[PDB]
Design a binder for this molecule. Sequence first.
Ligand SMILES: O=C(O)[C@@H]1[C@H](C(=O)O)[C@H]2CC[C@@H]1O2
Ligand SMILES: [Zn+2]
Ligand SMILES: [Zn+2]
Length: 315
Amino acid sequence: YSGPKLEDGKVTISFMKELMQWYKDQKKLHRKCAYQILVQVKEVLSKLSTLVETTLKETEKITVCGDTHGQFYDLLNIFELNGLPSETNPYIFNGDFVDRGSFSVEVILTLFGFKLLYPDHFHLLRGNHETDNMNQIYGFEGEVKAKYTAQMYELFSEVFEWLPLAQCINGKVLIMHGGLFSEDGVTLDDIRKIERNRQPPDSGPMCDLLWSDPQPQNGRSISKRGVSCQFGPDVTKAFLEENNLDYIIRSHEVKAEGYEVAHGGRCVTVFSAPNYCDQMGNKASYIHLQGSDLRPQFHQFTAVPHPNVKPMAYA
Ligand SMILES: O=C(O)[C@@H]1[C@H](C(=O)O)[C@H]2CC[C@@H]1O2
Ligand SMILES: [Zn+2]
Ligand SMILES: [Zn+2]
């Protein structure tokens, strides 16, 4: 093995560039480097609040991406389009890094590696697919067992349970993967107290944050997903009012243009997996915010070439 090696047991910026090239060429990170990343990233993530609270000063910016779904070569395209993560080019990836696409291992190890290199500026939130249920069925477990072992997979599963569930920028924008809640009256403080290091339950706030979807009409509906609900603009507006927030950003649904802004501006969807599963034909986007003006700016982009491995080949 002549592949990327950690320097003094730790991730550095040449290690990350070597890993990206290595993975682009479709090679495997040695199992012990992988293990060292996973156990160090568990340690980092387990000190985080369930709600990450970040301050963006006026000349600072942050990029928000939504679901990426094992589409590694499109992840590389985002970094070419937008620049590598760094203390001055912060990122939040809003859940759903794995499943569906067949380069989930490459995506998750690159994002974990960057979380290690810039822990105050590179942010990962849980989505509905960072879960054992989902991974068993949709590709990730099959992929970790083909490339590594059942054991390495259990370690992934445990790391995911410590990924924070939401992030609030400047007490004004809150970002979560799914959306808002199936009961009124939830506060940021309640979110901060969810004990997140578990598989999600069937109902309740932790389930809503990973699973819920906005609807255009006022009220709440039973979800067609079979879990959580659909929340209308009256839901968003009461939630934003009680918590003193401006709007939320979520992901969790494919959009033709890569973004949508529902609820009169209050509920934004960002989706970062272009030509999702090699089929949907959609565009993707990411959002920039800056401290002096937190309104979202969307940047769209389309799929790039990748190796001939079919989506879900590992399911
Ligand atoms: O992100 C998607 O395209 C889908 C839905 C989502 O919940 O985010 C979910 C189920 C399969 C995919 O992940
Ligand atoms: Zn989702
Ligand atoms: Zn998804």
